[PDB]
Write a structure and sequence with these properties.
part of a larger assembly; 4 chains; A mainly alpha; B mainly alpha; C mainly alpha; A: mainly alpha; 1 helix; about 85% helix; C: mainly alpha; binds cardiolipin; transport (chain B); CF(0) (chain B); membrane (chain B)
Chain lengths: ~55, ~90, ~80, ~55
């Protein structure tokens, strides 16, 4: 036997839902490049360390 | 030189006059824009949804097909008006 | 009370009625271009105090004409790719 | 003298507005990485062309 929403909450819910959906898409977009670049430059660093131990074994 | 600088001071007074003339025309635009200091009422939502359903009624049976052109032209132009705001939101994006 | 009316007067249901009551022969094409030119002329030009707007329209029209003519050769330098 | 909205349109407008705001944020997020990577790989390609004309001048 469903119990009708005290409408305050039925309002408060789905709004916040879509707020969070937007927040998530925004975070994804805003964050991808920084991590991509930090990791790629760390890859430069690790290749350099590899060649270091190659010449400084 | 200094006279040109003095002319610039007069120009500054002229610029103040330019602001002075713009403000009443802007105030008339403000009178049209002063209707809402908070988001629109959810009171007429019923009227709008009911008008929408009445449009659907006029559509389903094929009765709106007795209209004249000018009316449909107007309707479509305001439809495209509403539409441009979608790209406007994209702009915000 | 009339078969032929201003295309704005006619309705959508009888839309094809108007489309079929009217003629299409090139003579009836000149006899349309003329009506357009003369409406413009006798409404915005042939008046004792004609203004800029009595002329500026055809200029800013020719402009858009020759812009459309050129659209092809301008898709090659859009500053942004994904529009 | 403002003219009250025929409410249909006052409804139709701001909805579409925020739809478009969401669409824009989503497009931004979804699109950034692909272009970043295509351009960076094109940079690999152009460095390769540079070294090509270096050795094949
Ligand atoms: C030989 C010796 C040679 C000597 C050369 C010297 C000149 C010789 C005599 C020619 C003078 C022209 C007369 C004239 O200008 O009309 C005023 C004059 C005054 O008319 P009025 O009705 O009595 O009063 C009007 C008020 O003045 C209206 O006042 P207002 O307060 O309402 O102001 C309205 C204004 C203000 O409103 C606005 O603020 C609108 C703002 C938005 C702008 C529009 C959008 C622009 C978008 C980009 C803007 C980004 C910024 O609206 C506009 O901005 C309209 C401009 C839009 C562009 C249209 C351009 C058409 C120009 C036509 C002028 C012809 C010049 C020919 C000269 C020869 C070549 C050098 O018109 C006449 O009385 C008769 C006109 C006779 C025209 C003769 C043309 C001969 C045929 C020429 C063919 C070749 C065309 C050449 C095209 C180039």
């Amino acid at each position: 036997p469903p119990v009708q929403v005290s409408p305050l909450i039925k309002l408060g819910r789905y709004s916040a839902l879509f707020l969070g959906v937007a927040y998530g898409a925004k975070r994804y977009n805003y964050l991808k490049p920084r991590a991509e670049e930090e990791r790629r430059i760390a890859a430069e660093e690790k290749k350099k360390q590899d060649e270091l131990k190659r010449i400084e074994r | 030189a200094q006279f040109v600088r003095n002319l610039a001071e007069k120009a500054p007074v002229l610029v103040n006059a330019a602001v002075t003339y713009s403000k009443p025309r802007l105030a008339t635009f403000w009178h049209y824009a002063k209707v809402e200091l908070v988001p629109p009422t959810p009171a007429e939502i019923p009227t709008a949804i009911q008008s929408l359903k009445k449009i659907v009624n006029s559509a389903q049976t094929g009765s709106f097909k007795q209209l004249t052109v000018k009316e449909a032209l107007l309707n479509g132009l305001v439809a495209t008006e509403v539409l441009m705001w979608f790209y406007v939101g994209e702009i915000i994006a | 009370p009339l078969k032929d009316r201003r295309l704005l007067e006619v309705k959508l249901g009888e839309l094809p009625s108007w489309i079929l009551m009217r003629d299409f022969t090139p003579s009836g094409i000149a006899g349309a271009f003329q009506r357009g030119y003369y409406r413009y002329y006798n409404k915005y030009v042939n008046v004792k105090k004609g203004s800029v707007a009595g002329l500026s329209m055809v200029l800013a029209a020719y402009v858009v004409f020759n812009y459309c003519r050129s659209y092809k050769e301008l898709k090659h330098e859009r500053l942004r790719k994904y529009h």
